[PDB]
Structures are given as structure tokens and as C-alpha cells.
Design a protein around this nucleic acid. Structure first.
Ligand SMILES: [Ca+2]
Ligand SMILES: [Ca+2]
Ligand SMILES: [Ca+2]
Ligand code: NA
Ligand code: NA
Lengths: 151, 151
DNA sequence: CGAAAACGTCGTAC
DNA sequence: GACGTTTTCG
DNA sequence: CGAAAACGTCGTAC
DNA sequence: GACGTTTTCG
């Protein structure tokens, strides 16, 4: 899945505008470290324009559209295709380039982050950075909170 | 003032995201038909990212940035340069392409719209069209409104 | 007058 | 825009 | 368990 | 995002 340059240039600007590059630390006992690292690339749009989101699903060839009322979102969370997509988009972003680099870095690091409790906590630090870059306003689960892992 | 393709492709996506192509019929006795036709190309952005709007002023080479509190806007209203810019940006727009064409068409038509009251009113019809296409919500001055110029 | 700049603000669509 | 919590899936 | 899908909502930045 | 009203400028 290798994309067209004209498309990526256009999409990077659309993303810098209404997209979001999100990293979350999700709490849950089921997981080894009681938290799951989650990554999302998303594009939001008023539902009467949903066709646009649908066309993203067609060109990126992966991901899906969810509806949440008057608004919809194109969503891409699958680690492998997300990494493939972000890598190609990264060179054209201007406003969300750093968070794109951070997500790429987090993905490449997941394997060894399951291994030690200190590698996992470090990676969580990178998600704090992504949220600081974002216009974050209702964040709850922080790397700091994961640190109350101390027994 | 002929722009670089990569730059237009990217800006077209940003504009589809947080930009706005605007046509307004503005009331005022000073004008022959008691209304002034106004066109605006704008890009809005949070003031901590105003550098990004300043960078637009630099590349487009015309227009300016205005501050309105926690938010700012890159503004381009001069008919000649706006026509030039919209013509080159127009082919890459996907969501605001129609309003961009309508604005180009209104601009080309301004000279003859000062001539008859009927041509003027027809042009006002095109601005009703642009507002229909936009996510309009507080429009007051309509082509219908102008029609009560009837003596 | 004609045209742009300046200034101000409602209601979501991010 | 950018999170949150809850449910499915393998 | 691990990872994504599904579902839900706060607070602006358009 | 997409309008509004008021002031300047030529
Ligand atoms: Ca934006
Ligand atoms: Ca936006
Ligand atoms: Ca938008
Ligand atoms: Na921030
Ligand atoms: Na509309």
C-alpha cells in the first residue's frame, strides 16, 4: 500500500486542518502492565460530507468510517497499515508532523515495550509528548498515572 | 504571482479543512445600489499558531493576518490578487471548489454588474449560492434583501 | 462612490 | 479535535 | 492477554 | 467557519 504524492500533499493539509494524530494509554487489568497503548489517525467531518470520509477509506484502502451523530470520522488504528500510511504522509505535514514522528517512533518501539516495565513507561512518555503537542483538553490517563504501577 | 504546485496542493487541503471562501452583500447608502459586493478568502487558526498564517502571507505575497483574541485569520480580499490566487488554487479544491468557481465568476462579472440593477441582482444570486454551499448560519443580507431596492 | 481594512460575534464542526 | 470507556475478536 | 472496534462526550478553534 | 457592522482610503 504505497500512495500517490498529489494525494498525500492534499491530505496532509486536510489533516493539519481537521485531522488528529492521537496516542492513548488505556487502563485495563487484562493487560500485562494494566494499560494498553493505543494509536489513532483520524479525520473528522460533518456527516452530510461523509462521502469524503468514505473516499478516504477507498484511497488509503484500510481503516473505516464511524458515525457519531451530526459528525463522522475516518479511523485508522491498525498498527501495521497505520505505520505504512503515516510514514508516507509525514513528509508533508506541517502542523502535526512531530506528533506523526512520535507515533511512528512509538510503533517501532512496541515489541520491546512489552518486555520491561521501564521501557513501557518510557514509551508512555512519548505519548505525553504527543498530547502536549495536541490541543489536549480532557486527558486523564498519563504516563505519570501508569507509574503508580509501583506494585 | 504564480504559485508552486506542491504549495497549492497542500493549501487546498488545509483550506478545505479550516479555510473559508466567502461572498457578502454589504449594506450601505454610499453605494450606487445601496450594497457593496465583497469577497473574502480566509484561513482561520488559533493564535499560538499564528506563525502559520504569517507564513501564508509570505508565500502568497499579498493579504494579511488579523487577530481576534485567541484566534487569527489570514485574509485576502483584493479582487485582482484574489482572482489570481483562486484560479490557481481552484483545481485542487475538493470541498470548496464550487464556491471558489462562483467567486471567480463573480469577480469576472463585477464590471457589468455596476451597469444595470438587474445584472447586479443576478450576481447577488451567485452569492446566495456560495452561502448555500457553505455551512452558513448567521446570514442576514440576501439577494432577496437587495431586491427591496425596488424604488 | 467604490473597495478594502478593521472591528466584532454566532453556532457549530471539529 | 482529542480524548474517554466499554465490548469484540482472535 | 493483546489489539482493534465500538461507543460516548468535553471544550474549543474554527 | 461564516457571516455581521463600522471605519479608512483613494
Ligand atoms: Ca484545525
Ligand atoms: Ca477545523
Ligand atoms: Ca473543516
Ligand atoms: Na497543546
Ligand atoms: Na450549507
Amino acid at each position: 500500500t504505497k500512495y500517490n504524492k498529489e494525494f498525500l500533499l492534499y491530505l496532509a493539509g486536510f489533516v493539519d486542518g481537521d485531522g488528529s494524530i492521537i496516542a492513548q494509554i488505556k487502563p485495563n487489568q487484562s493487560y500485562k502492565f494494566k494499560h494498553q497503548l493505543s494509536l489513532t489517525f483520524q479525520v473528522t467531518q460533518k456527516t452530510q460530507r461523509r462521502w469524503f470520509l468514505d473516499k478516504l477509506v477507498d484511497e488509503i484502502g484500510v481503516g473505516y468510517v464511524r458515525d457519531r451523530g451530526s459528525v463522522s470520522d475516518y479511523i485508522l488504528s491498525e498498527i501495521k497499515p497505520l505505520h505504512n500510511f503515516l510514514t508516507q504522509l509525514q513528509p508533508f505535514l506541517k502542523l502535526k508532523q512531530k506528533q506523526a514522528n512520535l507515533v511512528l517512533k512509538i510503533i517501532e518501539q512496541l515489541p520491546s515495550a512489552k518486555e520491561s516495565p521501564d521501557k513501557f513507561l518510557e514509551v508512555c512518555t512519548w505519548v505525553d509528548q504527543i498530547a502536549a503537542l495536541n490541543d489536549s483538553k480532557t486527558r486523564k490517563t498519563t504516563s505519570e498515572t501508569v507509574r503508580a504501577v509501583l506494585d
